[PDB]
């Protein structure tokens, strides 16, 4: 590669993984969405009935300042970038079922990755 | 448990089961409907703020 290709979301879910910025799970995520905390909502695509997708992008794009999103694919790898760790001979080695809706609360950090994604979804 | 936001067409949300009157409950959690009841479960027992 050159620098990275959509790995800049991985680093931010890692910073909200270790330093407790993930409202991980749709219900706790919507508690961070029905709070001013959410300046990142990262959803997935292949879900069933599409109504919770409608929930996520509804509360993530509703008219209140509060419009965070970028976008990212499948649930279980999104949860792997997000917070649940059991590494154990680290070749992905897990019984993990998906997370599919994780929301970063303030991300507690800064530059090129996190400043890049804020520059990236803020200004085109 | 909480899929209950009646989010209308792309992308306005009408929040159902209107929310708790608590600073611990910063417009996030909801109030159950038992009987004469809307109920804060977050604080495990304390509030009957009911409509």
Curated annotation (Swiss-Prot), chain A:
Gene3D superfamilies: 3.30.1330.30. The keyword Ribonucleoprotein applies. Its main location: cytoplasm. It is found in: Cytoplasm. It comes from the Eukaryota. One of its GO terms (molecular function) is structural constituent of ribosome. InterPro entries: Ribosomal_eL30-like_sf, Ribosomal_eL8/eL30/eS12/Gad45, Ribosomal_eS12, Ribosomal_eS12_CS. One of its GO terms (cellular component) is cytosolic small ribosomal subunit. Keywords: Cytoplasm, Isopeptide bond, Ribonucleoprotein, Ribosomal protein, Ubl conjugation. One of its GO terms (biological process) is maintenance of translational fidelity. There is a cross-link at residues 66, 76, 95 (Glycyl lysine isopeptide (Lys-Gly) (interchain with G-Cter in ubiquitin)). Component of the ribosome, a large ribonucleoprotein complex responsible for the synthesis of proteins in the cell. The small ribosomal subunit (SSU) binds messenger RNAs (mRNAs) and translates the encoded message by selecting cognate aminoacyl-transfer RNA (tRNA) molecules. The large subunit (LSU) contains the ribosomal catalytic site termed the peptidyl transferase center (PTC), which catalyzes the formation of peptide bonds, thereby polymerizing the amino acids delivered by tRNAs into a polypeptide chain. Component of the small ribosomal subunit (SSU). Mature yeast ribosomes consist of a small (40S) and a large (60S) subunit. The 40S small subunit contains 1 molecule of ribosomal RNA (18S rRNA) and 33 different proteins (encoded by 57 genes). The large 60S subunit contains 3 rRNA molecules (25S, 5.8S and 5S rRNA) and 46 different proteins (encoded by 81 genes). Belongs to the eukaryotic ribosomal protein eS12 family. This is Small ribosomal subunit protein eS12. The gene is RPS12.
UniProtKB/Swiss-Prot annotation, chain B:
Transmembrane segments: none annotated. Component of the small ribosomal subunit (SSU). Mature yeast ribosomes consist of a small (40S) and a large (60S) subunit. The 40S small subunit contains 1 molecule of ribosomal RNA (18S rRNA) and 33 different proteins (encoded by 57 genes). The large 60S subunit contains 3 rRNA molecules (25S, 5.8S and 5S rRNA) and 46 different proteins (encoded by 81 genes). This is Small ribosomal subunit protein eS31. Component of the ribosome, a large ribonucleoprotein complex responsible for the synthesis of proteins in the cell. The small ribosomal subunit (SSU) binds messenger RNAs (mRNAs) and translates the encoded message by selecting cognate aminoacyl-transfer RNA (tRNA) molecules. The large subunit (LSU) contains the ribosomal catalytic site termed the peptidyl transferase center (PTC), which catalyzes the formation of peptide bonds, thereby polymerizing the amino acids delivered by tRNAs into a polypeptide chain. The chain holds residues 102 to 152 of 152 of the full protein. The gene is RPS31. It is found in: Cytoplasm. A zinc finger (C4-type) spans 20-43. There is a cross-link at residues 6, 12 (Glycyl lysine isopeptide (Lys-Gly) (interchain with G-Cter in ubiquitin)). The modification Phosphoserine is found at residue 21. It comes from Saccharomyces cerevisiae (strain ATCC 204508 / S288c) (Baker's yeast).
